[PDB]
Each structure stands twice: as structure tokens, then as C-alpha cells.
Amino acid sequence: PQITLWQRPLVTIKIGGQLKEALLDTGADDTVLEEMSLPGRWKPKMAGGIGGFIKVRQYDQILIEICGHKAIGTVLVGPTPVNIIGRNLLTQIGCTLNF
Amino acid sequence: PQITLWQRPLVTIKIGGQLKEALLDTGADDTVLEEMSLPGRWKPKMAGGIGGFIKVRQYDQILIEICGHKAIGTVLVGPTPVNIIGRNLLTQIGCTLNF
């Protein structure tokens, strides 16, 4: 689908058997999800946004189903205000900017 | 142009007679630019991303040329680590997401 940007580009993702709403975010290198129940081993990391840094849990090779399309990659989990889908997953679903 | 997301989507902007590189950011509501020389009256305002909030100077109706396309709108200037073009300008150059 083509998405215009008059609204926040919020899509429906399915991750860890759960349904969530996330923002397709071209300005993000990585995917960062709010505190949620995820299975597996992890490694502690920091993510540097606009106001500073947040301590997140890094999970590798996690499956997300973004708006009907499937991707497998790195997901960070931490105290972020919005669920962010970054470029590490957006490339896998073939997402492009167009103007 | 079509822009894929394997790299940061950086475009050349021209603002206030000057050339800068800015990130095309679907995950940003507003346009925020690194400390730079702009003419005009401003209003103090507060942008909050991941990790907290930054104090910015708000200018209304700044002309920006993004990758050859002209746009006029609100530009925030503050201690952002990256120049960010947000949806308030992205909508004006007919920028869409596609997958």
C-alpha cells in the first residue's frame, strides 16, 4: 500500500503472538518497542534519540508481521513513548519513500 | 525520486541561503534542524523524542528546498544531533511511503 503522511503512519504489527500498533519510521535505524512480553535471551543496549539515551533490551532474529508482511530481525524493548519500526525491518518488507 | 531505506534517507536541503543534509523522517511530526543562522522572530517551544525533551526556537513559514522541491512551514532550531525533515514539510513535497 501507499501511505501518505498527513497522519502518523501507524500500522498493525503482530509480534510475540500479540497485536500492537507501530509507527513506520524512516528516521530510525532500529526497531524499538514499548515494554512488552518477549521470549528469548537478550543483551543490554542504549538507544540515542532526540532528548538523550534510553536503556533497552536487544533481541535478535525476532519475527514481526507488519501490515500483513513478514520480517525477521533485531527488536529493542525499552521505555519508548511510541512503538517504532525502523529501517532494519522496513527494508525487509520493501518499504520506499516516494516524491 | 524513489528512495530505499538500506541507508539513512539523507537529502540536500537549502534553508536560509545555506546548504545542509537532512534526514527524511516519516516518524517525525515536525522538522527540527541543528543550531543554525536563521532570520526572523521566534517563539520558545519544547520537542520531546526518545530519551527526553529539547528546548528549541520555533520559526513559522520558513522556505526550505528539499531535493529541488520547495516547501514553506514551521522549522524548529535546537540542539538536535541530526537535521530532521518531519511530516509537516514531507506532505508538501508529495512524499509517500510504499511497500
Ligand SMILES: Cc1cccc(C)c1OCC(=O)N[C@@H](Cc1ccccc1)[C@@H](O)C[C@H](Cc1ccccc1)NC(=O)[C@H](C(C)C)N1CCCNC1=O
Ligand atoms: C515525534 C516528533 C515530534 C516533533 C518533532 C520531532 C523531530 C519528532 O521526532 C523526534 C524523534 O526523535 N523521532 C524519532 C521517532 C520518535 C517518535 C516519537 C517519540 C520518540 C521517537 C526518529 O524518527 C528520529 C530519531 C533521529 C536520531 C536521533 C539521534 C541519533 C540518531 C538519529 N531517531 C531515533 O531516535 C532512532 C530510534 C527511534 C531507533 N535512532 C536512535 C539511535 C541511533 N539511531 C536511530 O535511528
